[PDB]
Amino acid sequence: XXXXXXXXXXXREEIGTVIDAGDGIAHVEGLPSVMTQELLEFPGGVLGVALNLDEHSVGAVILGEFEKIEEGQQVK
Amino acid sequence: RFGRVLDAEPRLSALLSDYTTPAEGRVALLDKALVNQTAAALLSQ
Amino acid sequence: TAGRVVRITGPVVDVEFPRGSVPELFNALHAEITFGALAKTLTLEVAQHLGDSLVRCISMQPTDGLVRGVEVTDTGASISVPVGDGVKGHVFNALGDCLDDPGYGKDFEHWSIHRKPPAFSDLEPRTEMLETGLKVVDLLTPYVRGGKIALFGGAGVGKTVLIQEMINRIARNFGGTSVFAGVGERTREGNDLWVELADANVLKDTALVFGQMDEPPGTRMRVALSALTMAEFFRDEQGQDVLLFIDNIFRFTQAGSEVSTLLGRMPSAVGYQPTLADEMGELQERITSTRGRSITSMQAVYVPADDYTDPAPATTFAHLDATTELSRAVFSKGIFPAVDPLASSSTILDPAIVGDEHYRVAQEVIRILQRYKDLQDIIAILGIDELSEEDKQLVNRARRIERFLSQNMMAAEQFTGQPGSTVPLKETIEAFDKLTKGEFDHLPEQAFFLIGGLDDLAKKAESL
Amino acid sequence: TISAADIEGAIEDYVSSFSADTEREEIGTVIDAGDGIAHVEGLPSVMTQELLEFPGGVLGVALNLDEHSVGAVILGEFEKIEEGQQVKRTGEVLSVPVGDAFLGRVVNPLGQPIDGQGDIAAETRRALELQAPSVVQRQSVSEPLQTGIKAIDAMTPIGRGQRQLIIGDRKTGKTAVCVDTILNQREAWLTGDPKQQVRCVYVAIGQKGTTIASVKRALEEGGAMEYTTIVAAPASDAAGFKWLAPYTGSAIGQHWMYNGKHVLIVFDDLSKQADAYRAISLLLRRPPGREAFPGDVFYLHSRLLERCAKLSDELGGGSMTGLPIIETKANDISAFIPTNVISITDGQCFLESDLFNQGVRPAINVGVSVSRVGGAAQIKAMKEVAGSLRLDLSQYRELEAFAAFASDLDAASKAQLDRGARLVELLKQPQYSPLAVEEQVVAIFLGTQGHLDSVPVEDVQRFESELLEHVKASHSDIFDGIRETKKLSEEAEEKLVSVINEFKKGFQASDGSSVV
């Protein structure tokens, strides 16, 4: 009983940050609720596809304007 | 005794696995759920 | 007790469970996809245990729209498929869900698709010939009861007609039923088959299982085992003979190689899965006869690049006992069922297993057809008038033997309205023994087409 | 009849013999499992290649012992394994039970019965990885292993302690030849002397269950199941069983061999063991060498076949003879596994499929088969009568290839061509028909001494079969003289020629003609 009550007592949209980028791929951390193949939009108006979902970070392939991606950019 | 409680409560033990979560809110939950004072201090350490 | 989805990579999904509740491998798990355009219930099969209570899975459906940290509910059993008489005349996916009428068959008994082959003590200690009642099959390439038969051919070579034929033969002569396993079949060809078997009105006795090409390689691999689990029930519990079509067993091998690569296992010779011969053996050994009942199999088998050394066909041709090849050069003569008498082969065709007279007559008919096949070039280039008399008397018999392999098969009854014949073996081995000796050479070629049995030849000769 | 006393006495023996040692032991836990391999944590005391056991009644081999965990390969139904299962030590290095109680039984590679006939009354246990007898312990192969195939016993004799490779294509009679060889021993087994009393092991790797059952039946019907044991690893079981099946077969054999019995081993077929080891290695993520095989497949097949030898009299005069079968992908005898095994064994009997379909059966390729032991194991009668035949047949084959389009030729070529055609017709025989050596010598005498030179090619097989039954009904002193002295003396040879002439003077030819 007491454990269930403690758990229930212990229990705005999310923005991820780019932790890695190279050769047309970026890895985005965070985004707990992203779905496989959701469109991600990066701050330079470039888009990514969120094609891989690791334990820590999303692997997102980038459509087109890859040069405009830097570590620490906000991903909506 | 705490080990007995954590092993008998698999959902609480899993929710206690907090290294990827914010440890401060995890410790606050564990102190509010969890006596010998020094034992509970080691547990919070 | 429920698990969480922790990692997703293409069709592969990892799930984490509470410490004490990790599912046994090959269990089916269910997961939800909630996005409006792609709403699904997603079935996962457990492949490996990665430690830390993580379970490696492969998805039976596309993983698009899946979100991290959704709940996963274990079913606590393997993938299970419905079994019973009410399976006949319906179409199922690999997962046992019906395509002809959704939600049908939920109330049936369900069996685990992953089950062991027969015990050693239960196998039949000798091969028995299957008297299928088709002249060409029985004489030149006898089928083995509970054996596996390779089939070769394509469109415009009667292949679907031969399937309808064999289904009718098993239903009428042996009181059995058929199962058809569309292992990676074209959805267009699956609908053409479904409509063809419905129009022939044979579908009432056939269970169809399709693993369509549209779905990920986990399903194109498990479909063959699903169909085989329906057939195993009909053999063991109903006590019927069963005929299991597989089309096409190469795609079972390929699907297995692709799953193995998604699981990151290191690939072997020319890139197949490293388990190949056991992956296949755990299917092919399970097709057999026991306790006087039998699962016969016909298997269409593609060969990559036409070389019978590639591990896919080299593995497959270790298991199978007979080989029927259909030829467009025979079909274009009007010879139905267009089984090529020289390119087809069988391994039961030995004087120890069939009577010495059967073996002799089969060797004589092969010799005569081989001679005619060697003369056909001279005939086409120079004309019959360039031949001697001794060989032209051989060709006069070879033309008639080639025609007399044709039969009014039961599949044609839809069109011709005349019934199909079923010649006894002891009739056909007399008829070809007489025909090779030339006793019927005074009859015209039209008297032998589509004829059936020897008494029918006597009727048609007096009609003409 | 049956009695209640035996059943009650067996239960009372189990009950009275029941005790528990209460022994202290390390229990480990499975931390990873997949695809027929598992990793175990704990087990501080486990030996390398200790046989483990798992809760499902499943065994495993501890191959790799890391700082934190033990990589165990799973033998049998790895489906029953899951993470967090406890594992315990059997306390034994990888071993099989062994003894005379295996004669007439079918067992899986672990030495568990698979026939359902009953438990195995094992004498002791033997470790699989005991080294082969060293260069000082062996003796020269000097003793005939009669196969009862004319083609083999004439040109490629098999001696006790030889390894003879039965390399061939798919569906050419390789299994038929080995079953014929196992059947032929029954005429010896009915004698009591261990010196003649050869006993046999057949190990099936990756065969169809129907093919194993068919062999079990053919050996029962011949009476060979008095002295044959079958290790069965059929194509349906896990890769670990297909990998062990040759080793356990040799281990069952070696226990008899070192006692001074004579043993025969048939490996059917050793390519499917190589493929199983390729599976187990690539699942371990070891890198592949040539043809995707791991670097050590040579150390698989040599470690196996080197167990087969003849021992020196100082170690007891026992011996083990190996017939490994290999399957060849479209007759490319230069493939990796073919050449590896050809480099180990003391010779090969290549079976060519292009001949088998013409009805030359057994389809022995006389031009490529050899015996590198040679005539040292062949009885002096057979050695004298047949020892020319091999080269005469090879030069007949090249002559036939030349003359196939020669419009006319010299008389010496034509006479040689007709002799060679009659000798090829002489060497074939039907399935399950083992001929005793005392008859094989006479069948080959007919050929080599030209007594067939009257006979048309279509008559020859009939003629030879009939004449052997003639000399079996009357004039048996030919076969008694040959067998009791192992040499064809002149005073018998004249009686033979006299029976030959007396038969030719009464021979109706199959064409309706007659000859002398």
mmCIF file of C-alpha atoms in Angstrom, chain D residues 113 115-120:
data_model
loop_
_atom_site.group_PDB
_atom_site.id
_atom_site.type_symbol
_atom_site.label_atom_id
_atom_site.label_comp_id
_atom_site.label_asym_id
_atom_site.label_seq_id
_atom_site.Cartn_x
_atom_site.Cartn_y
_atom_site.Cartn_z
ATOM 1 C CA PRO D 113 18.767 -42.671 -25.879
ATOM 2 C CA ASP D 115 14.850 -44.599 -29.856
ATOM 3 C CA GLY D 116 12.593 -44.617 -26.733
ATOM 4 C CA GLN D 117 13.684 -48.243 -26.135
ATOM 5 C CA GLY D 118 15.014 -47.704 -22.554
ATOM 6 C CA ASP D 119 17.828 -46.196 -20.437
ATOM 7 C CA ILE D 120 21.506 -46.960 -21.279
#
